[PDB]
Amino acid sequence: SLPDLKIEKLDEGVYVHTSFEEVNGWGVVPKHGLVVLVNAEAYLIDTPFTAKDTEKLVTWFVERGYKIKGSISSHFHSDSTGGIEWLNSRSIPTYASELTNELLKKDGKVQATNSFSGVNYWLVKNKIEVFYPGPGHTPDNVVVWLPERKILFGGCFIKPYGLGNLGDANIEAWPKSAKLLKSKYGKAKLVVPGHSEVGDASLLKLTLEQAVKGLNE
Ligand SMILES: [Zn+2]
Ligand SMILES: [Zn+2]
């Protein structure tokens, strides 16, 4: 019996959703995503692990007068993509990078309906920016920038306390990717990691340090 899905307002037009998975390796793991409001429309930044929690998340927003316009998954792991099957089945548009969709296809997983490539991709012009810093936590990890609030969703790329599971990681590339990310979004007010507490721009520096330290060893 996992903890309940949580939805908490972070800032004007921005909510953090927290869902939980059981893992023999630590135990129960929280995963943070966002919901971003754009004029009575809602965008999912990462899905919960499960169809059920994705449905609970959509319904919470639909019952408050928001149309779910889309989801974007920051990387191929189930903690960002677990909801894509359900969203596709409800004809809610799903987004992931060409790299993410290729990794989903390789692993026998259902793909996002819409894909993008390049360093920069606007999901919503001037409101929701996707940035590819390069390989790190996974080959495909992207971040999501909300320029109006200076909020960065770093997702599972942001690892200020330790790099965690290296199974899909590029330890050689991560320091370069993290250097690029810190340069691009050094002015971030809020950085939202995948698996630890919301913080300021310092999580970018801490991530860089862990990536450097991880490569050295
Ligand atoms: Zn991951
Ligand atoms: Zn993760």
Resolution (A): 2.0
Print burial letters for 181-194: b (CB count within 10 Å at least 16), e (below 16): bbebbeebebbbbb
Indicate whether 13 belongs to any domain: yes
- Is 4 a catalytic site residue? no
Nearest-angstrom CA–CA distance, 181 and 34: 19
Q: What type of residue is 202?
A: S
Q: How far is CA 139 from CA 29, 132, 148, 175, in A?
A: 22, 10, 28, 13
Q: Examine the residue annotation and report whether 79 is marked as an active-site residue of this protein.
A: yes
Token readout for 142 is 């992207």
195 is in an annotated binding site: yes
| Residue 181 counted as domain residue | yes
> What sign for the dihedral angle of Cα 182, 101, 118, 83?
negative
Solved using: X-ray
Inside any domain, residue 1: no
Is 92 part of a structural domain of the chain? Answer: yes
Q: Give the range of the structural domain holding residue 149, as residue numbers without chain letter.
A: 6-216
- DSSP character for 109? -
- CATH number for the domain that contains residue 189: 3.60.15.10
Report how many domains make up the chain: 1
CA of 17 from ligand 2 middle (Å) equals: 14
Q: Catalytic residue, from 159, 170, 182, 184: name it.
A: 159
Tell me whether residue 82 is in a domain: yes
Distance between CA atoms of 140 and 135, rounded to whole angstroms? 6
| Total Cβ atoms within 10 A of residue 86 | 22
Crossing angle for the helix pair 174-184 and 202-216, to the nearest 10 degrees: 170
The answer to whether residue 206 is domain-embedded is yes
Residue 164 is assigned to a structural domain of this protein: yes
Residue at 51 is within a domain: yes
Confirm whether 11 is a catalytic residue: no
206/178 Cα distance (integer angstroms): 10
